Paper text:
Movie frame micrographs collected for these VLPs, at two different cryo-EM resources (West/Midwest Consortium for High-Resolution Cryo Electron Microscopy and SECM4) yielded capsid structures to 2.84, 3.79, and 3.25 Å resolution from 29,596, 7564, and 5234 particle images, respectively, for BuV1, BuV2, and BuV3. For BuV2, at the lowest resolution of 3.79 Å, only the main chain for the residues 381–391 could be interpreted with confidence. At the top of the 5-fold DE loop, BuV2 residue 160 adopts a different conformation to BuV1/BuV3 residues 161/163 that are structurally similar. This structural difference of BuV2 likely stems from four amino acid changes in the DE loop compared to BuV1 and BuV3 that share the same amino acid composition. BuV2, which is the most different, has more rounded 3-fold protrusions due to VR-I and VR-III and 2/5-fold wall is thicker and more pronounced than BuV1 and BuV3 due to the larger VR-VII. The melting temperature (Tms) of the BuV capsids determined by DSF were 64.9 ± 0.2 °C for BuV1, 77.3 ± 0.3 °C for BuV2, and 73.4 ± 0.2 °C for BuV3. Interestingly, BuV2, has a disulfide bond between residues C210 and C289 of 3-fold related VP2 monomers. The residues are located below the section of VR-IV positioned on the 2/5-fold wall. This interaction is not possible for BuV1 and BuV3 which conserve the C210 equivalent residue position but have V290 and P292, respectively, at positions equivalent to BuV2 C289. The BuV2 disulfide bond interaction could contribute to the increased capsid stability observed.
The BuVs, along with CuV and TuV belong to the genus Protoparvovirus, which prior the BuV discovery contained only animal (non-human) infecting viruses, and are classified as novel Primate protoparvovirus 1 species. The VP ORF encodes for two overlapping structural proteins, VP1 and VP2, sixty copies of which assemble their T = 1 icosahedral capsid in a predicted 1:10 ratio. The VP2 monomer extracted from the refined 60-mer capsids of the BuVs contained the core β-strands (βA–βI) and α-helix A (αA) observed in other parvoviruses and large loop insertions between these secondary structure elements. However, unlike the animal protoparvoviruses, the bufavirus capsid contain three separated protrusions surrounding the 3-fold axes, as has been reported for members of the Dependoparvovirus genus, human parvovirus B19, and the HBoVs.
Author numbering:
A (entry chain b): 277 to 471
B (entry chain a), C (entry chain e): 33 to 567
D (entry chain b): 521 to 567
E (entry chain b): 33 to 80
Amino acid sequence: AYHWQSQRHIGSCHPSTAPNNEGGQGTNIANINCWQWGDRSNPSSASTRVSNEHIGYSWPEWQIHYSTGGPVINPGQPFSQAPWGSTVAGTRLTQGATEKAIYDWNHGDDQQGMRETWWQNNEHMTGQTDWGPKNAHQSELNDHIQSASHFWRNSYHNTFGPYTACDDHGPQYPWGAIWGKMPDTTHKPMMSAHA
Amino acid sequence: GVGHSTGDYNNRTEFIYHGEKVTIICHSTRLIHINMSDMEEYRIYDTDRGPLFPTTQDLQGRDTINDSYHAKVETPWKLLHANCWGVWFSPADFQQLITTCREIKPSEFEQKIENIVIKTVSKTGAGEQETTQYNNDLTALLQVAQDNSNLMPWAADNFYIDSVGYVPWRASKLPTYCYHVDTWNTIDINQADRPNQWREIRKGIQWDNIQFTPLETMINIDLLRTGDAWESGKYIFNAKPASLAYHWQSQRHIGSCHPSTAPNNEGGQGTNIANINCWQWGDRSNPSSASTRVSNEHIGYSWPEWQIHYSTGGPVINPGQPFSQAPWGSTVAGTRLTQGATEKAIYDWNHGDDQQGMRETWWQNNEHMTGQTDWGPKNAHQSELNDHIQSASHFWRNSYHNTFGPYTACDDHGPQYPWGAIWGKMPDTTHKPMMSAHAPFLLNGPPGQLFVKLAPNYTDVLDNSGTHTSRIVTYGTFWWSGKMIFEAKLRTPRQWNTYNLPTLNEREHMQNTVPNAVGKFELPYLPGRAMPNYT
Amino acid sequence: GVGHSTGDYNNRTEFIYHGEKVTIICHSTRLIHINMSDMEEYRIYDTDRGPLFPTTQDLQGRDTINDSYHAKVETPWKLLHANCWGVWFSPADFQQLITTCREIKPSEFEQKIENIVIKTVSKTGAGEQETTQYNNDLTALLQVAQDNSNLMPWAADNFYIDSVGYVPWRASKLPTYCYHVDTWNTIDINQADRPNQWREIRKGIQWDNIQFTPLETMINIDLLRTGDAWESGKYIFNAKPASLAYHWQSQRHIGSCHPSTAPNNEGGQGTNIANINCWQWGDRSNPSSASTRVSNEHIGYSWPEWQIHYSTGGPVINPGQPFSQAPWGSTVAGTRLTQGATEKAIYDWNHGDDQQGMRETWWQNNEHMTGQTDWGPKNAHQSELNDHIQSASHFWRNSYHNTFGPYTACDDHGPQYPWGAIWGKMPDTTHKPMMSAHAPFLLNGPPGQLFVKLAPNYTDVLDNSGTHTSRIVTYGTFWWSGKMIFEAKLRTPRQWNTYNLPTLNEREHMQNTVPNAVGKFELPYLPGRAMPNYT
Amino acid sequence: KLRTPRQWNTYNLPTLNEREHMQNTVPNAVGKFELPYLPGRAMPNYT
Amino acid sequence: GVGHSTGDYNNRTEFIYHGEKVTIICHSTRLIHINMSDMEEYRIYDTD
């Protein structure tokens, strides 16, 4: 299965009044009764509430990694761009982990002759989506709204942390790999992208 | 039965000591006041954006947070959950927990519902007088639904506390069960086009794959007339114990004392020895100093926060590492800075109907943990570690990048009373959370929710405006019971010097905890986190 | 008992797989709201002709149909029946039925009624205020009558659906039991006297042989006070399995490929071989062609329809063969032609109290079956089959005669959801129906009807205008339960290419199925008929 | 371990993506065809 | 043997259901066309 379930969907519904009209369109209740992340009196809102976990981690990518030993690409977290404008036939942006695949003889000796390509999005997983520059880190979480300074709109730093929970893009057909060799290393890969 | 009293009300907490081990049996039992169930029907709708959500600039990207636009499926099911600590422990009891025993893992859980009483409102009057006559219905249906298989989506948290009340002698009403469905809330702050202002990419709901898991479509449901007791379910936890102590022990305190000469005067004030004999991190001849030495581990990880995280899927905040600001100027009553992970908590009826009326707040610091402290911008990364002092370039004073690494060792802020959550559901994901912030325990699955609703009672004519006038207004009441079993290992003193024992914080003071002359009082906050310890 | 909860509410569907075989256990349980029983007495009367029934020409013979003049014996008995599919299967479940397993024969049926609650209306007021006080009657009689012997005439169909509701959380009221008695409705269209206009030969009822089978005159009836559970009856079906697949395979596709040369170009476009080597139907030398070749069977039979059938006894329609019009221009949103067997279905409360208010319609095509298609006038019968091409005479382009013959092989339109009928009573007749249109199963006898009525509760004085004021207005409520057992054989893939899986039709789209913000929704239509298959 | 339905509403079953369409999968008149891409990833689920 | 057909070609996939559990037995068998082995010798070289 794939998880559309994402962060801010995991806990209970933020209390609200059911709409009288059909359909609402509302409505929201201000005074609660819930935890908050900072020193935050107002407004208490579902944007900020404590949750035992976090889904997805922003990655600074695409990252060209120069080692002995490369250039190589260090993977990011697989997620769809569908919630954003990216879709097949525009706007096509690859910012997720989206791996094109070249094939042979799907039409061969026709000849195309080159090549058979795919590039899954991969569109079904909307839960883990992190578009790195969209995030913003701010110093003070005080309920007072944020000043000019202290708010950094574009930053690419790795957000992976011990709380996070992430998924690979899982078995995919036909061209996937049922298995691959775990390396022999004192630390071991926690999850293997594409395998 | 047919009315004969079918149940018992036992609220007590009784410790056991066999001295290698501490078994804690804590009962609880509490009244519950349930009514309708205003509309009989599963519904789905979009909550509005939010109170302060930006309508227009120049608020620009600043206020993009604190917006709560979600789509829920409101359902006519009320659930009640034990996840609060305060449910199972009277404050004077929770002392003996954090004083004696240094870690506790819940073991066995049991609960039973007896005995149901349902009565209906009947209004009789001309409008000069309206005489409401409250009469029992011996034929009435309180239907209880248990999940041992965790099929329902997990709604049970103390986030939005809404848990069965803490005060044993007060009747506590239940929350209403609803859970989220697939939405797209995505907004942007770049904007890249459009510098500096925000847009709403796509909203608000996606009907293609939406999941409606109308209940009563999974689970065996039981009917309870007056005089019967739904019981029980028998749950057996398995979970990793969690230590009650807090670690003042931090990095640069873990290894041996950097050799030094004892002072002759009283007191020194010194003194330090230059020539050693120790490892160093870089190519470093001089000075060899305890600032730089190799250690098998590192405590704490700087996090870039606070980080507003925009996903489908939010705005949401991705947590940091919990630590105190006490070593820095931050303290209650100034300078108050929140830069750690410090989570304020809103409460109800601590003074209610006084009325405050709004609200009861806390915001622990949390002050006791000084070990893990990382104030992100304080750190600096420099290129060359050569013993030669650093040049103008190569030294970057303020940088916010994540320092979490495979060497690090970190701790959550642990069990905290009353408002904590004894457990929360570990997600189902190929990678699993290594540690859960604000929850002392994660479970492959927990004891499932307990669902309860009064079955509808219709007037003769159900056809027109049934919701407005279909069924007879009704409210039920019943006692809820529970049993927990905790295991523990008590701490015997590791010190010669006298401990500083747990007590309510300086912000709190006693006579607010003991009931007011009119019977209003608040519970204290006492983590828990009680006793310092080595590492 | 004496009130103690006597019953359980379980709505669930749990598959079993032993892999040769698929056992499907589908529970259902649903509330029921019953009141009087307006008049206590068996009655017999004639319904009026009909809304559009012709009063006068020039409508002439055209409108002679759609008249419903029947004589019924209205009785004070309400019956509830499970024959709808939607009763036993949630749509998401009925997927797994038609996806996995290709035929299912119901096996075992069981049902039980618990627990009864009966309360009466009492009106107290001066007319400035009328205060209705709804109070239980612990002494009240809900009397349930079972037929295991099928003595009562069969009233149980989903024709005029009126079945216990589909939505498990909504309280569904029952239909009122009545059945037909001997009548003569006969009308003529010739008229032969009188060309072109219609007369009414004889009406409306015949008292000579009329059969009044006043109930309570056959069957053991049980009384239920609050706190007892009428159970059960144990029924065991025996019936012929019915395949879930649909056959695109039609005549001229059954035998081997007519030999041909593969094309060199991509793609062909050809090519065909003239000289064969095969059988032919007539005296036919040239050309031997796949149009004419002997085959052991024939699929489908042209029917002359639509045929208005005038009997005693009607007007009624005699069915044709079910097939799609998709190969012809007919499709939803044009050209819509109904010439197949295509049966529209009227529904209630799919959006009710919105109000639409009228009505919820469907009209499946039914599009998936292309094999059996016969559009009557398209066919042509010619005298000489000689290889010489046909002359002016001997070729009759339009003729409507029945082509059904002993060679033919035909299929009904099979189980369809929700509104289908799992079973219907095979008639008792020296010749028996070979296949039943719209009913997937016929039974020598089915599980009989289940009859229920609230026993009357009289005021002290019953003598004058008892029907107007005799007995105290009353309504009961109780839960109905059921159990089915289906057996199946699941289909493993016979294809290399990817199947096209079952889903709601293009007419339907998702967010109408998931409840509306005010809680109104419709169920999808998804036969079932799901997977193509060979023949 | 097979999944029994957790929903009331009808699932959206797996099928080849909109980019793909059927007659490319079934062999061409000269016998050339491609295989579909269908993760797999098929069914939505809770968490 | 000495030529007698020594093998079987079975390409099939057959599910099993005991309903707690699904056992999937999927065979495959496929022809293979191999030639030399242009140079008999282990070699080492740098790709451009």
